[model samples]
Target: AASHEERMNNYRKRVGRLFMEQKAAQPDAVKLPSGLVFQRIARGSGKRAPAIDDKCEVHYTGRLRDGTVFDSSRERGKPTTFRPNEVIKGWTEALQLMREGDRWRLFIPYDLAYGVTGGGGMIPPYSPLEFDVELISIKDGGKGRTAEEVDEILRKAEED
Candidate 1:
């Protein structure tokens, strides 16, 4: 009989291989609706530990493959601001692959996104997401907000 841990290990391997195989069958390039075509450069180094903190500004557009726009920083005409680690699982993960001035499109499956439940309003259930992210800048806790301030923010989120 297999232990739960062993079963989980097998499942992880299977999922990883599936993602790899999908990558392998590609025709070496992808065209996005934004008129951005890119040769698939590199499979992301799927390091699970996300690095960016929350205080970062990024310009982004999120849309479906059919080009239905769900979200856009450009539509706001102002950069969206947030603490890096405070975003969705995929956004937190995706931001790690970006740097200042680097623009990349992230193809996020539903499981990595709002999941089967989906976010309210514009986001629908089980919808895979395409995000064009422009990492404008990143700033850490350098504004002397204080440790107490940070703790208060975290506590408020916990309360929410």
Candidate 2:
């Protein structure tokens, strides 16, 4: 675990770049793809990042970088459950940003996920996580900056 200062620095530097870089690299007025093959999945500590610890009921449709459909809850006829902290960093953050009954497409980068060494089972080594998540309900309350608020901020981001 990183020290408080280290963790703070990391959150600021790493998360911002990963978030910004992906968007910047995209062409203007473009529609981004929903998934990404990841190598690193950044995770916020559950204790420190309470928003990343709670369980949320969700529906999801997942795919690989090749656009190969891997999984889908819509077809399965059930919403799934996920613990933000237990999942990859990207999911934790992105999920926290949503409210109950939200569907979000996450574009995760490898460096923010199961980097060089991947989780063996569902994840291969150096794999990046890509998920299309639909939040059905949230169990155990957690505070977070909602997508609506974030969008308002980002829309005026270049402004003084």
The prediction achieving the highest lDDT against the true structure is 1
Q: Which lDDT tens digits does candidate 2 get at residues 7-39?
A: 664554465356545644553311223333222
- Cα error, residue 95 of model 1, in Å, equals 0.8
Query: Where does model 1 exceed 4 Å of error?
Result: 1-50, 140-160
Off by over 4 Å in 2: 1-50, 140-142, 146-149, 152-160
lDDT of 1 by residue, 49-132 (tens): 124564667788888645689989999999998655687766765555444454566666556677656676776555566677
TM-score of each: 0.57, 0.56
Predictions in order: lDDT: 0.56, 0.54
Displacement of the residue 37 alpha carbon in candidate 2, Å: 12
